Design an enzyme around this catalytic site. Structure first.
Site, PDB file in Angstrom:
ATOM      1  N   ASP A  47       0.818  -1.234   0.000  1.00 33.66           N
ATOM      2  CA  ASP A  47       0.000   0.000   0.000  1.00 33.66           C
ATOM      3  C   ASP A  47       0.861   1.299   0.000  1.00 33.66           C
ATOM      4  O   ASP A  47       0.596   2.240   0.759  1.00 33.66           O
ATOM      5  CB  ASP A  47      -1.061  -0.015   1.139  1.00 33.66           C
ATOM      6  CG  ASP A  47      -2.098   1.125   1.167  1.00 33.66           C
ATOM      7  OD1 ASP A  47      -2.182   1.894   0.174  1.00 33.66           O
ATOM      8  OD2 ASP A  47      -2.788   1.276   2.204  1.00 33.66           O
ATOM      9  N   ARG A  60       0.133   9.347   1.323  1.00 33.09           N
ATOM     10  CA  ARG A  60      -0.662   9.276   2.546  1.00 33.09           C
ATOM     11  C   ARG A  60       0.033   8.406   3.592  1.00 33.09           C
ATOM     12  O   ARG A  60      -0.096   8.670   4.783  1.00 33.09           O
ATOM     13  CB  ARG A  60      -2.098   8.795   2.249  1.00 33.09           C
ATOM     14  CG  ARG A  60      -2.200   7.345   1.843  1.00 33.09           C
ATOM     15  CD  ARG A  60      -3.575   6.991   1.357  1.00 33.09           C
ATOM     16  NE  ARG A  60      -3.574   5.661   0.740  1.00 33.09           N
ATOM     17  CZ  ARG A  60      -3.511   5.431  -0.567  1.00 33.09           C
ATOM     18  NH1 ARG A  60      -3.492   6.438  -1.428  1.00 33.09           N
ATOM     19  NH2 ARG A  60      -3.500   4.196  -1.023  1.00 33.09           N
ATOM     20  N   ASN A  61       0.820   7.413   3.117  1.00 30.25           N
ATOM     21  CA  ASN A  61       1.591   6.457   3.894  1.00 30.25           C
ATOM     22  C   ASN A  61       3.075   6.821   3.985  1.00 30.25           C
ATOM     23  O   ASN A  61       3.922   5.964   4.229  1.00 30.25           O
ATOM     24  CB  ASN A  61       1.362   5.037   3.351  1.00 30.25           C
ATOM     25  CG  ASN A  61       0.099   4.409   3.900  1.00 30.25           C
ATOM     26  OD1 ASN A  61      -0.432   4.814   4.952  1.00 30.25           O
ATOM     27  ND2 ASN A  61      -0.418   3.414   3.204  1.00 30.25           N
ATOM     28  N   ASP A  81       2.666   2.821   7.229  1.00 28.65           N
ATOM     29  CA  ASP A  81       1.472   2.107   6.726  1.00 28.65           C
ATOM     30  C   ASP A  81       0.368   2.222   7.767  1.00 28.65           C
ATOM     31  O   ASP A  81       0.457   1.625   8.838  1.00 28.65           O
ATOM     32  CB  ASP A  81       1.738   0.625   6.352  1.00 28.65           C
ATOM     33  CG  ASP A  81       0.594  -0.096   5.642  1.00 28.65           C
ATOM     34  OD1 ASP A  81      -0.580   0.266   5.877  1.00 28.65           O
ATOM     35  OD2 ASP A  81       0.873  -1.068   4.890  1.00 28.65           O
TER      36      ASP A  81
HETATM   37  C1  LIG Z   1       2.184   5.158  16.993  1.00 35.64           C
HETATM   38  C2  LIG Z   1       1.287   5.269  15.822  1.00 35.64           C
HETATM   39  C3  LIG Z   1       1.268   6.646  15.217  1.00 35.64           C
HETATM   40  N1  LIG Z   1       2.305   6.964  14.281  1.00 35.64           N
HETATM   41  C4  LIG Z   1       2.662   8.367  14.053  1.00 35.64           C
HETATM   42  C5  LIG Z   1       1.695   9.397  13.953  1.00 35.64           C
HETATM   43  N2  LIG Z   1       2.085  10.694  13.674  1.00 35.64           N
HETATM   44  C6  LIG Z   1       3.386  11.006  13.485  1.00 35.64           C
HETATM   45  N3  LIG Z   1       4.341  10.025  13.559  1.00 35.64           N
HETATM   46  C7  LIG Z   1       3.985   8.778  13.826  1.00 35.64           C
HETATM   47  C8  LIG Z   1       2.476   6.104  13.111  1.00 35.64           C
HETATM   48  C9  LIG Z   1       2.131   4.629  13.543  1.00 35.64           C
HETATM   49  C10 LIG Z   1       2.380   3.556  12.482  1.00 35.64           C
HETATM   50  C11 LIG Z   1       2.114   2.189  12.732  1.00 35.64           C
HETATM   51  N4  LIG Z   1       2.371   1.171  11.753  1.00 35.64           N
HETATM   52  C12 LIG Z   1       3.431   1.298  10.711  1.00 35.64           C
HETATM   53  O1  LIG Z   1       4.149   2.324  10.645  1.00 35.64           O
HETATM   54  C13 LIG Z   1       3.687   0.163   9.693  1.00 35.64           C
HETATM   55  C14 LIG Z   1       3.097  -1.132   9.919  1.00 35.64           C
HETATM   56  C15 LIG Z   1       3.388  -2.199   9.056  1.00 35.64           C
HETATM   57  C16 LIG Z   1       2.593  -3.517   9.147  1.00 35.64           C
HETATM   58  N5  LIG Z   1       1.170  -3.288   9.261  1.00 35.64           N
HETATM   59  C17 LIG Z   1       0.614  -2.563   8.186  1.00 35.64           C
HETATM   60  C18 LIG Z   1      -0.846  -2.207   8.441  1.00 35.64           C
HETATM   61  N6  LIG Z   1      -1.582  -3.410   8.627  1.00 35.64           N
HETATM   62  C19 LIG Z   1      -2.960  -3.136   8.868  1.00 35.64           C
HETATM   63  C20 LIG Z   1      -1.029  -4.239   9.715  1.00 35.64           C
HETATM   64  C21 LIG Z   1       0.451  -4.513   9.486  1.00 35.64           C
HETATM   65  C22 LIG Z   1       4.091  -1.887   7.865  1.00 35.64           C
HETATM   66  C23 LIG Z   1       4.983  -0.773   7.854  1.00 35.64           C
HETATM   67  C24 LIG Z   1       6.064  -0.624   6.778  1.00 35.64           C
HETATM   68  F1  LIG Z   1       6.340  -1.783   6.194  1.00 35.64           F
HETATM   69  F2  LIG Z   1       5.655   0.221   5.808  1.00 35.64           F
HETATM   70  F3  LIG Z   1       7.182  -0.163   7.361  1.00 35.64           F
HETATM   71  C25 LIG Z   1       4.865   0.167   8.897  1.00 35.64           C
HETATM   72  C26 LIG Z   1       1.581   1.831  13.991  1.00 35.64           C
HETATM   73  C27 LIG Z   1       1.328   2.807  14.998  1.00 35.64           C
HETATM   74  C28 LIG Z   1       1.617   4.284  14.729  1.00 35.64           C
END
Ligand SMILES: C[C@H]1CN(c2cncnc2)Cc2cc(NC(=O)c3cc(CN4CCN(C)CC4)cc(C(F)(F)F)c3)ccc21
Length: 280
Positions: free
Chosen positions: A137, A141-142, A155
């Site tokens: 994805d 936005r991501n 994500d």
């Molecule tokens: C703390 C809270 C708030 N936060 C924040 C807000 N404002 C400013 N700064 C930061 C950002 C944030 C981000 C996440 N999750 C991730 O970053 C992510 C997760 C996965 C795997 N999941 C994808 C979705 N799926 C449904 C389930 C599995 C993949 C990847 C990657 F592969 F792309 F790295 C990264 C979790 C919590 C928060």
């Protein structure tokens, strides 16, 4: 795990079903690697077993993701309830809101700076490929924006109502961001690194539009599905995203290569970074 006593509330960044996000302060960081600003996602003590299970599956995934251009997982609080995950906090929010609030050289943004943002994205996607990890994805936005124009790939799933329009369902079956998906993703459901390159292409189009328009904004979701069919058909009825005004034909032909019908012809991220870093 991470001590909850070390998390100092600042702001509630948002809420949803089964949880809520907080912005917290951490003094003298001797747990990670003058207080540090952190982002905390906390599961509600009312959350279902399906919600608990999804949280631990997401923690499992994030724990291996260690790159300057990828969101870091600083820690978790899994031993007791409520469960929580602690990430780096990116002050300027997501790349879409960040770009949407800027004009090209309301603050300004330079063409070399647009490329520098697109260079961090390729270097980041390069890393996930070396781990044989498909993002599935990728879009602006991501992408999260920090100090000194730093970009870290994230994500959010389909949790924010703001981007509901970027997703097409398909019930019931699968909620998908078709406008960023390659033809094979739509027709077959064949997600690979080669299809991430197609998404990267569309993401670089977004950046050069300065997040001003949605890809194929004049066409219906059904018309875009129709268009995947034309790439498989290969009779010359297939269409492409138009050249953004502030884009040289050079950088535009790069986007076009991310949109090759054959995934073997699409250029890898190592090559996409090097071009975005050298040619301007
Ligand atoms: C703390 C809270 C708030 N936060 C924040 C807000 N404002 C400013 N700064 C930061 C950002 C944030 C981000 C996440 N999750 C991730 O970053 C992510 C997760 C996965 C795997 N999941 C994808 C979705 N799926 C449904 C389930 C599995 C993949 C990847 C990657 F592969 F792309 F790295 C990264 C979790 C919590 C928060």
């Amino acid at each position: 795990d991470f001590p909850r006593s070390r998390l100092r509330f600042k702001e509630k960044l948002g809420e949803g079903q089964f949880g809520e996000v907080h912005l917290c302060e951490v003094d003298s960081p001797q747990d990670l690697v003058h207080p540090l600003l952190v982002a905390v996602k906390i599961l509600r003590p009312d959350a279902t077993k399906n919600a608990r299970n999804d949280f631990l599956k997401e923690v499992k995934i994030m724990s291996r993701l260690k790159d300057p251009n990828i969101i870091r997982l600083l820690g978790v609080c899994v031993q007791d309830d409520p469960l929580c995950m602690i990430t780096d906090y990116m002050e300027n929010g997501d790349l879409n809101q960040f770009l949407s609030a800027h004009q090209l050289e309301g603050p300004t943004i330079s063409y070399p700076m647009l490329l520098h943002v697109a260079a961090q994205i390729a270097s980041g996607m390069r890393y996930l490929a070396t781990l044989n990890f498909v993002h599935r994805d990728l879009a602006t936005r991501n992408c999260l924006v920090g100090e000194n124009f730093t970009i870290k790939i994230a994500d959010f799933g389909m949790s924010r109502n703001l981007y509901a329009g970027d997703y097409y369902r398909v019930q019931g079956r699968a909620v998908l961001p078709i406008r960023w998906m390659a033809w094979e993703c739509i027709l077959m459901g064949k997600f690979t690194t080669a299809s991430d390159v197609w998404a990267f292409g569309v993401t670089l189009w977004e950046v050069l539009m300065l997040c001003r328009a949605q890809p194929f904004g004049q066409l219906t979701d059904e018309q875009v599905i129709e268009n995947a069919g034309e790439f498989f058909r290969d009779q010359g009825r297939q269409v492409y995203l138009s050249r953004p005004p502030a884009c040289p034909q050079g950088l535009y032909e790069l986007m076009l290569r991310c949109w090759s019908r054959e995934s073997e012809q699409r250029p890898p991220f190592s090559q996409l970074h090097r071009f975005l870093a050298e040619d301007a």
